[PDB]
A paper describes a structure:
[name] (ATV) infects crenarchaea of the genus Acidianus living in terrestrial thermal springs at extremely high temperatures and low pH. ATV is a member of the Bicaudaviridae virus family and undergoes extra-cellular development of two tails, a process that is unique in the viral world. ATV is the fourth most abundant of these proteins. Remarkably, ATV displays a new protein fold, consistent with the absence of homologues of this protein in public sequence databases.
Two crystal forms of recombinant ATV were obtained belonging to the tetragonal space group but with different cell parameters. Crystals of the first form diffracted to 3.85 Å resolution and included one monomer in the asymmetric unit. The monomer A from this model was then used to solve the structure of the first crystal form by molecular replacement. Refinement against these data produced a new model, at 3.85 Å, with R and R factors of 27.1% and 29.5%, respectively. Remarkably, these interfaces are not conserved in the first crystal form, which actually displays less extensive contact surfaces, the largest masking 608 Å2 per monomer, none of them considered as significant by the PISA algorithm.
Author numbering: 25 to 45, 58 to 269
Amino acid sequence: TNDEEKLADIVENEIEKEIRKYYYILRDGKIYPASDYDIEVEKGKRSANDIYAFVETDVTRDFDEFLFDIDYGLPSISDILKFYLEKAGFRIANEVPTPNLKYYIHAVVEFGEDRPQYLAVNIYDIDSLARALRIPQIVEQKLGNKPRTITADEFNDIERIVAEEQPILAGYTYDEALRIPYHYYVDHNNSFKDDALKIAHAYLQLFPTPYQVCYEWKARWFNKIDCLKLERL
């Protein structure tokens, strides 16, 4: 929890810095835009082994979408699978592995006009997330326990099972589980209530609850705020 609080302030300080004018957080706490860092790795300047946390920032202007991204803003299946496989020792084709990645961070910023209103930082433990998605079992069944370089075809075959085949939430495949609550919460379509609540109930029980830190934009800076106060708005 102390590491997670430190990580949320690192993200908040960076979003704030970016406002007034994708990321990796290294094991030393330094934050860099991921695109640039990937080029520095490709040059041999920086090491992919130093990446501790991956940050995905989403920006919104609709409050319902903001709350929905906070509550359902899980990392991409491709990302969790890639992060799991690499953390387990497997290598995906010619791609540079990130074996020491512990956290996936989803930061959501809500805007007023051209100026911001809120920031919500969600910190997920990658291992916990991979387990809830049944990724270890599926990888073991398909590839075995001994790590090696896998083909893009093998990665895709695993990805398909995890996201589009297995009923993971209230009998729905993962992709269906993403769509239905969007239709209810963001599209404000009431006929989707029953199914969204069923998915919500399963998701809140089965999926790991993230370390959540919230902030309000007040006079050119972010100020800490209670997340439970936020959900009421």
